[PDB]
């Protein structure tokens, strides 16, 4: 599992469950092509997006569908989605966890890059 | 001044000065088109992006060019940029401040929305 | 105005108004003694806490009364308060803004420190 | 394990390793008495602070020694420590994870309360 996404809810103090997440890779013509996707588990985690073989160096966009999450809880949100855009590069045996902490009008995102 | 962006540096505890910021508005054809751009001042603020006339209802994306910012300080950061996507003026005209707090592997963003 | 506190509400996307804030300074005997207090304004800011004369070198604690804030909005939050502890003016006099962004189970705090 | 602490470093994008953490419980005379302590692991986690039997309802303070962490990396920090103060209350079968995301001039803390 070289790329994992973890989302927390800062209003309810809990994992953010069932948040849709879409990942794109930037293509040579500069458009974003679908790469992988899923919904966060009861733990607020999404595992199994990709494999070491298919996660080559390149520029990726991870879109976390925050707006639908807040709307399924009855809470008016600000953002359409949270977006995390980064270049993945080999520089040894790396695992990438993209963490996001959500509030209706605010989010933070951090990358934890290990091994 | 219906749209303002403010950026702070979480490493230095200071405003993030001279940060490039590009705003796009989603077009009829589902495309991001250029809306406005500028650079943060010595206070870390960017004023004068638009006017209440121009700033109609729409889906906007504010792209904050964080990787260029960190690179110019000798830091190789995780993200290419911070992107903030939101529907604006859909409940009538409002005033929007988009704040971002930056660290090399992390950022947060909040919107303060007032009448 | 060498010490200012600013508080935003991450649920509403607005300044956090009427938030009580108590500042203490560590005494000779290792005790926290009262230094200054106030409430945030309609802008979410608290000005006029101290003067450059009074605001000497020292270890300060800024206690932001977040639980009272959330309770008055009908939210039962996690934290009793947000506490921000720091050494001040130890490199000579500076200007300190202590910002906090609040959610019911989460907060962030940053200091912006200028000459 | 009803109380767990997890700390991330937002400048290096990694767990914050070997951060000292002290937990206090508020006593009837209103002073903080030592309750539990440890240092975060290679995963940035601290497990085994307490047991269900000894973690009764009450007010607790978790102090994360951020200043020493930044000083062992060569980075001038703002805060003396990060403090998380909260009331623990039974309301079913609860586990408390206190998460903190550190930058030199800024931190966030969230509580994830599960089961
Ligand atoms: O900790 C934060 C998070 C978001 C915005 C701010 C902030 N904005 N202006 C000031 S001053 O501080 C501080
Ligand atoms: O206080 C925060 C803010 C953003 C992310 C987190 C976090 N906690 N665990 C992970 S993984 O990420 C904690």
How are the elements arranged and paired?
Four copies of one chain form a homotetramer.
Chain A: E1 3-9, E2 14-15, E3 20-26, E4 32-39, E5 45-46, E6 58-64, H1 66-72, E7 79-88, E8 95-103, E9 106-114
Parallel strand pairs in A: 1-8
Antiparallel strand pairs in A: 1-2, 1-5, 3-4, 3-6, 6-7, 8-9
Bound molecules: 3-(5-mercapto-1,3,4-oxadiazol-2-yl)-phenol (2 copies).
Main location (chains A, B, C, D): secreted
GO cellular component, one term (chains A, B, C, D): extracellular exosome
GO molecular function (chains A, B, C, D): hormone activity; hormone binding; identical protein binding; molecular sequestering activity; protein-containing complex binding
Outline:
The structure is a homotetramer of 115-residue chains. Chain A has 115 residues and is mainly β.
Describe this structure in words.
Chains A, B, C, D: L-thyroxine binds at residues 6, 45, 108. The structure is a homotetramer of 115-residue chains. With 115 residues, chain A is mainly beta. Chain A has one domain: Transthyretin/hydroxyisourate hydrolase domain (Immunoglobulin-like, Sandwich). In chain A, 6% of the residues lie in helices and 53% in strands. Chain A has 1 helix and 9 strands. Chain A has one helix spanning 66-72; strands at 3-9, 14-15, 20-26, 32-39, 45-46, 58-64, 79-88, 95-103, 106-114. In chain A, strands 1, 2, 5, 8 and 9 form a 5-stranded mixed beta sheet that branches. In chain A, a hairpin with a 5-residue loop joins strand 3 and strand 4. Chain A is globular and about 40 Å long. The first copy, chain A, starts with a strand and ends with a strand. Chains in contact: A-B, A-C, A-D, B-C, B-D, C-D. The interface between A and B is medium-sized, with 21 and 20 residues. One 3-(5-mercapto-1,3,4-oxadiazol-2-yl)-phenol sits between chains D (6, 8, 99-101, 108-110) and A (6, 8, 99, 101, 108, 110).
């Amino acid at each position: 599992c070289p790329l994992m996404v973890k989302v927390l809810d800062a209003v309810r103090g809990s994992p953010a469950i069932n948040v849709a997440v879409h990942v794109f890779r930037k293509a040579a013509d500069d458009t974003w092509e679908p790469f992988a996707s899923g919904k966060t588990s009861e733990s607020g985690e999404l595992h199994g997006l990709t494999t070491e073989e298919e996660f080559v160096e390149g520029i990726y966009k991870v879109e976390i569908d925050t707006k639908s999450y807040w709307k399924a809880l009855g809470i008016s949100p600000f953002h359409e989605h949270a977006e995390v855009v980064f270049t993945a590069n080999d520089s040894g045996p790396r695992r990438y966890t993209i963490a996001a902490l959500l509030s209706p009008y605010s989010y933070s995102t951090t990358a934890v890059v290990t091994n």
